Design a protein around this ligand. Sequence first.
Ligand code: DGD
Lengths: 127, 48
Amino acid sequence: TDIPWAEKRWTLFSTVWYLVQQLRFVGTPPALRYVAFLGWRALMFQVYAAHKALVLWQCKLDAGLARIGSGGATATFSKTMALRRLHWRNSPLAEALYALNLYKTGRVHLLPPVAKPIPRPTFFWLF
Amino acid sequence: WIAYGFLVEWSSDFITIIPENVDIYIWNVFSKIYRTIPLSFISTTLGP
Ligand SMILES: CCCCCCCCCCCCCCCCCC(=O)OC[C@H](CO[C@@H]1O[C@H](CO[C@H]2O[C@H](CO)[C@H](O)[C@H](O)[C@H]2O)[C@H](O)[C@H](O)[C@H]1O)OC(=O)CCCCCCCCCCCCCCCCC
């Protein structure tokens, strides 16, 4: 009932992509879809554990860069920024700006703005 | 006897004296047979 009209656009790319979705849903057996779904679930759990470890290491790097830049006083790290990295709410520019900010003035609890969601790209009748 | 024995069948439109059950059965058999055609075509053409 609340489909955005940008997702109901008919284009050449969506015409091609209907074939992929049709082969996925009515062209491939649900048994093979189920075993592929289980494999993708296990792989996504593994990559989530990897991303969580990477975020914890980025917290340690946050503390290191916050010491080199404020001398030795500020050595903590922003837990809100840790959750922001974990929830993918940060742009790479925001990450670089925050890291540089730590490295040369400290200020752990001064955070970059949250990145807006990326809108769906549209190019006329192409996509 | 010919009434029951091949007159009311030979003189009637065969759309009338044919259940929709056999049409549904033949369509189901056909659609079950030719169901792997997209995946098999993709596997043949995307192979070596
Ligand atoms: C206990 C049972 C023993 C086996 C069970 C587990 C062992 C092995 C699991 C499968 C093999 C390895 C899978 C790893 C990657 C997944 C493959 C894939 O591309 O990804 C598959 C995706 C994932 O499933 C769907 O995926 C959807 C879309 O998400 C993802 O979809 C894609 C994932 O490829 C993209 O990555 C995309 O970015 C991402 O969003 C949903 O999110 C859900 O996760 C789910 O509905 O499916 C799809 O779209 C495609 C549908 C058809 C593809 C079939 C591929 C493999 C089929 C094996 C059949 C052999 C039978 C014998 C059994 C032994 C198994 C080897």
